[PDB]
Write an enzyme that holds these catalytic residues in place. Structure first.
Site, PDB file in Angstrom:
ATOM      1  N   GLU A  98      23.400  29.441  59.057  1.00  0.00           N
ATOM      2  CA  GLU A  98      22.826  30.192  60.167  1.00  0.00           C
ATOM      3  C   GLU A  98      22.974  31.696  59.956  1.00  0.00           C
ATOM      4  OE1 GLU A  98      24.554  31.906  62.839  1.00  0.00           O
ATOM      5  OE2 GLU A  98      22.686  32.289  63.922  1.00  0.00           O
ATOM      6  N   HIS A  99      24.033  32.115  59.266  1.00  0.00           N
ATOM      7  CA  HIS A  99      24.142  33.521  58.877  1.00  0.00           C
ATOM      8  C   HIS A  99      23.187  33.865  57.739  1.00  0.00           C
ATOM      9  CE1 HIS A  99      27.578  33.225  61.426  1.00  0.00           C
ATOM     10  NE2 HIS A  99      27.890  34.494  61.239  1.00  0.00           N
ATOM     11  N   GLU A 109      35.068  38.071  61.592  1.00  0.00           N
ATOM     12  CA  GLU A 109      34.810  37.887  62.996  1.00  0.00           C
ATOM     13  C   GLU A 109      35.774  36.832  63.482  1.00  0.00           C
ATOM     14  OE1 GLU A 109      30.847  36.583  63.696  1.00  0.00           O
ATOM     15  OE2 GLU A 109      31.087  34.671  62.648  1.00  0.00           O
TER      16      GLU A 109
END
Lengths: 98, 21, 35, 41, 51, 400, 418
Positions: F50-51, F127
């Site tokens: 997804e990144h 993150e």
């Protein structure tokens, strides 16, 4: 009826301690909510009148007759504020039954 | 973070139904 | 009112069950033979 | 599983089953126990 | 503020929903002029500021 | 309300659309692929893909993808859950032609430059190093770990830092080539779109996509850290599922409940879920709240009231998503409805299922799902006064 | 059904659209933002915004709260520096009592002193929750340093004013700014007729033009807040166009040329001239965008930067330099066309939702008394041309700037250095 109410007001005897009528109400939940909604000056006068009446009852004295609370003069200050508390209280109650 | 490790194994404790249990 | 009625109707069955337990309990404990 | 859902899940019923069972247990226990004592002596 | 700000909109629009990490629970002390301040504190002597 | 029309292509990809007079559109691809389909050796493959999915495809090397979808004036978006993955674009309807071709690249022909792979790894990792700041997400990713111990539903969407560091193009390629099958894909469109034009575009592009016991464990995880100012506690039981009919009578129950931040959730996965409440309170009051919550659940179980049910049915009635909510909200609903139910449930059927709910079946279903059940408890913060499992389990039932 | 915008005689601008929606929405828009206070009644609009569920002449607080939650409807208050909007929404079969509740709240409040005394703690809690993020504090600081009197007033109540706002100040604010000539009642999913009947039973009694506000005056300056955050936030703005000019359209095209938010998740927002000019020199994480906030007498346009404290300087400089390039004519027509497409797509997606549509109609009503069809706007945005954009830029690069900074500001430059 007006004169007999004045005679009963003299016979009740809280005017001899300098109290108002609304000072003599028993502090239930609605009465404490009405007392909490009072303005600061009325609340301070009520607390001073109650303290003076307690001091006079401690010494078993009463005020001089010129300092008593004249029936005509007594002001039902807590009454207006109280009705609301009761009104609001009832409204919530009926809504409960809904 | 909170995903580094997985719940420790309870195999020696877990019983291999709820209503009965 | 209506709501409290719903509440009563909803709990009275449970209450009856509780009373039933008491009936057994009291009788068993009292050993009242009439029962 | 049925029992749990019927007499052991609702606390009120849990009490009912307990009380009723106890009411009869005494009968059974006393009877059984007495049999044993008598047999012993 | 629909076309003018776009992404910046939520900064200029309180939106108290009224009816229908969280705030973390967000002092009384004992009791003019002009001159550069000079703070003073003492081991036992109470502190003071002679501006 | 206009009906949602569904067609099916060679690949098996479904093409769902719900035309509306709004002008822009939200065209998205849903995929039945999440952390539940990962096998603990590729626990962050969906997140890391997804990144990587917006960093260029053969056709759009480098920033091309973002540039064009930027030029067109389209706010592309994406997200991943434990069961579904979504890549959607909000754009002016006329741009469907490119809103669809772009989406085709994103699902197939994607390019996972190893160079980029390296950076995204760092991004995700860093993150995550800070993802700990989202206490609520933490609480909810343990309410998952301790409730679904030993299953693929315990593991998080992001995965453990370990896997994140240890991931390679080929692995990703696998997840991509394994969980991106055409029969497990829905092309959903909402807003100013024509269904025949969207079907022709799906036939032209995206017609290449290849065609090929979860358990709840009543348990408890307590992360005690007394330096935090507030405590977050989530208590859940086993949700019926996505397809279970009683879900609706449970939503009404949540609408009845609605210390601090006392939210309520009904998270649904494929024949399972978590139904419960999350609340954040000062440490000293955690006990009180936990109890209050229980008393309430119990209230519904034995003492509902038609009036309150109504309050609940109505709030539920104003939650249903619709053209008014906008394209994205709707698309999102179209994609989830085709992935989970296999069809788009219209709002009239939702209204019928809401109006058939009364107080008796609400307390019956609540007694089925809340009464005398073993909960999953997840606490984080100053949680010493949070009661242990016997007190919560005893609060899951009433003597009377 | 095009909005049947109609202006009742008093001034109320009634507008409606029978979309035959399942869930309707009725809002009421008043020109009573925080710009209409002065130094004696600061924070009164915040308490007025939070006082929407108080006792009214017609319904108590209990009746309002339990009646809105009984039908599952929603009552919300949104406030800018110019405008307040009270919005209710619900099923079409309950919007009669929803309009009863909303119009009672707007027209006949009581403002009992014990209720506002209970509400002041909620005022403090709401301010803390709002200032939990750095953007809100830096925008409030930027407005406070940018303006002198009107738009410098904060949206949230100051710390000293909590405990000092009285019932008389709320009554004076309502009696001086909640008049019919400053109000528009906007309804999506309702008949226009009913709006009018509710507009006569209510919204017609208070009919003055109210108290006129002062003209906002620019001051310039810079306010800095050293608070030890990990990231430095900095907004540098200048005076720009107001509501009702084509130069406002030029400034909107200018922010969409410079960059007005990412369109791709995890994108680098490649195109943003700002983002490109920062990213060609700095490898640290950053977030640079263009800020534009225009009100009916004055506007602010500038740059907004979030960056690591260390690089905070040259990143800001790089962003500033990019705007100077746009002030020198260094732009391409394809970039301006892409900016126009981004702006018009953002407008259409803003009006695509029901509450955004109701807000837009509302704003237009109070602002110009007229409804501008989405189409009309599209051709006006198109009117903006390349030179126009350049022009607005030079306005920013020349006009005295106002700077709000927060964080570890050891390497954050000043305005005379910037």
């Amino acid at each position: 009826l007006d004169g007999f109410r004045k005679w009963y007001y003299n016979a009740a005897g809280f005017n001899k301690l300098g109290l108002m009528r609304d000072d003599t109400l028993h502090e239930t939940e609605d009465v404490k909510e009405a007392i909490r909604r009072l303005p600061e000056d009325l609340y301070n006068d009520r607390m001073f009148r109650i303290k003076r009446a307690l001091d006079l009852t401690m010494r078993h004295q009463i005020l001089p007759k010129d300092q008593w609370t004249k029936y005509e003069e007594d002001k039902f200050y807590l009454e207006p504020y109280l009705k609301e508390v009761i009104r609001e209280r009832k409204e919530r109650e009926e809504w409960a039954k809904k | 973070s909170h995903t580094d490790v997985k719940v420790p194994d309870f195999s020696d404790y877990r019983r291999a139904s709820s209503e009965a249990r | 009112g209506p709501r409290y009625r719903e509440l009563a109707r909803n709990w009275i069955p449970t209450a009856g069950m509780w009373g039933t337990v008491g009936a057994v309990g009291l009788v068993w404990a009292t050993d009242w033979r009439l029962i | 599983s049925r029992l749990y859902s019927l007499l052991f899940r609702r606390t009120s019923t849990f009490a009912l089953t307990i009380a009723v069972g106890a009411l009869f247990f005494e009968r059974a226990f006393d009877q059984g126990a007495d049999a044993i004592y008598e047999h012993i002596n | 503020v629909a076309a003018r700000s776009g992404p910046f909109a939520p900064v200029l629009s309180a939106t108290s929903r009224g009816v229908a990490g969280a705030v973390p629970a967000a002092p009384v002390l004992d009791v003019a002029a002009a001159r550069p301040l000079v703070a003073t504190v003492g081991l036992n002597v109470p502190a003071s500021v002679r501006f | 309300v206009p009906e949602t029309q569904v067609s099916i292509l060679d690949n098996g990809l479904r093409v769902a659309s719900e035309q509306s007079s709004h002008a822009t559109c939200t065209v998205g691809v849903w995929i039945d692929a999440g952390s539940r389909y990962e096998t603990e050796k590729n626990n962050g493959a969906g997140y890391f893909l997804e990144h990587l999915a917006f960093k260029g495809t053969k056709n759009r090397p480098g920033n091309a993808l973002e540039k064009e979808v930027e030029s067109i004036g389209a706010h592309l978006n994406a997200y991943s859950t434990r069961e579904h993955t979504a890549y959607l674009i909000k754009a002016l309807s006329k741009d469907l032609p490119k809103v669809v071709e772009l989406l085709a690249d994103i699902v197939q022909n994607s390019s996972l430059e190893d160079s980029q792979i390296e950076k995204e790894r760092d991004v995700i990792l860093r993150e995550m190093q800070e993802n700990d700041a989202s206490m609520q997400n933490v609480v909810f990713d343990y309410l998952h770990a301790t409730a679904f111990q030993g299953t693929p539903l315990a593991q998080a969407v992001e995965g453990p830092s370990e896997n994140v560091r240890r991931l390679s193009r080929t692995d990703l390629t696998d997840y991509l080539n394994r969980h991106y099958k055409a029969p497990r894909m829905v092309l959903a469109a909402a807003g100013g779109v024509e269904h025949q034009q969207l079907l022709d575009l799906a036939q032209k592009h995206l017609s290449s996509v290849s065609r090929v016991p979860c358990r709840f464990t009543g348990s408890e995880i307590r992360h005690r850290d007394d330096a935090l100012p507030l405590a977050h506690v989530a208590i859940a039981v086993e949700g019926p599922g996505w397809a279970n009919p009683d879900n609706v009578t449970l939503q009404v129950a949540n609408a009845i409940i609605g210390c601090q931040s006392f939210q309520t959730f009904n998270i649904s996965y494929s024949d399972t879920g978590l139904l419960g409440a999350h609340f954040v309170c000062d440490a000293m009051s955690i006990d009180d709240m936990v109890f209050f919550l229980q008393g309430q659940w119990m209230r519904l179980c034995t003492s509902a009231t038609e009036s309150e049910v109504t309050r609940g049915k109505n709030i539920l009635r104003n939650a249903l998503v619709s053209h008014l909510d906008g394209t994205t909200p709707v698309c999102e609903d179209i994609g989830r409805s085709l992935l989970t139910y296999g069809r788009r449930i219209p709002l009239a059927e939702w209204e019928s299922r809401i109006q058939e709910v009364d107080a008796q079946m609400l307390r019956d279903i609540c007694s089925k799902y809340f009464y005398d059940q073993c909960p999953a408890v997840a606490g984080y913060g100053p949680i010493e006064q949070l009661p242990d499992y016997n007190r919560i389990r005893s609060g899951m039932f009433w003597l009377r | 059904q095009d909005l049947e915008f109609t202006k009742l005689p008093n001034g109320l601008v009634i507008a409606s659209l029978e979309n035959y929606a399942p869930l309707s929405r009725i809002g009421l828009f008043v020109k009573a933002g925080s710009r209409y206070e002065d130094s004696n009644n600061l924070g009164t609009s915040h308490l007025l915004r939070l006082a929407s569920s108080l006792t009214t002449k017609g319904a108590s607080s209990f009746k309002i709260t339990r009646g809105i939650e009984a039908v599952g409807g929603k009552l919300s208050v949104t406030a800018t520096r110019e405008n307040m909007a009270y919005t209710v929404e619900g099923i079409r079969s309950d919007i009669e009592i929803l309009m009863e509740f909303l119009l009672n709240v707007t027209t006949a409040p009581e403002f009992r002193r014990w209720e506002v005394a209970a509400l002041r703690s909620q005022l403090k809690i709401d301010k803390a929750v709002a200032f939990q993020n750095s953007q809100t504090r830096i925008i409030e600081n930027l407005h406070d340093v940018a303006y002198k009197n009107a738009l410098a007033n904060p949206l949230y109540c100051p710390d000293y004013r909590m405990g000092k706002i009285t019932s008389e100040e709320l009554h004076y604010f309502v009696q001086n700014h909640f008049t019919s000539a400053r109000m528009a009642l906007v309804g999506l999913g309702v008949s226009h007729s009913v709006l009018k009947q509710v507009a006569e039973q209510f919204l017609n009694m208070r009919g003055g033009l109210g108290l006129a506000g002062a003209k906002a005056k620019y001051r310039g300056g810079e306010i800095r807040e050293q608070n030890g955050d990990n990231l430095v936030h900095a907004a540098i703005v200048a005076e720009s166009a107001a509501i009702g000019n084509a130069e406002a359209n030029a400034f909107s095209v200018l922010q969409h040329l410079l960059g007005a938010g990412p369109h791709i998740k995890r994108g680098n927002n490649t195109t943003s001239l700002l983002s490109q000019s920062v990213a060609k020199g700095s490898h640290q994480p950053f977030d640079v965008s263009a800020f534009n906030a225009s009100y009916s007498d004055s506007g602010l346009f500038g740059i907004y930067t979030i960056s690591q404290a260390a690089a905070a300087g040259e990143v800001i400089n790089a962003a500033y330099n990019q705007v100077k390039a746009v002030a020198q004519g260094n732009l391409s027509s394809a970039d301006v066309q892409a900016a126009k497409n981004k702006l018009k797509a953002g407008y259409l997606m803003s009006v695509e939702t029901s509450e955004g549509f109701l807000s837009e109609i509302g704003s237009q009503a109070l602002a110009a008394g007229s409804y501008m069809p989405p189409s009309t706007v599209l051709q006006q945005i198109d009117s903006v041309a390349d030179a126009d954009v350049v022009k607005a830029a030079k306005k920013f690069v020349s006009g005295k700037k106002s700077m709000a900074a927060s964080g570890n500001l050891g390497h954050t430059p000043f305005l005379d250095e910037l």
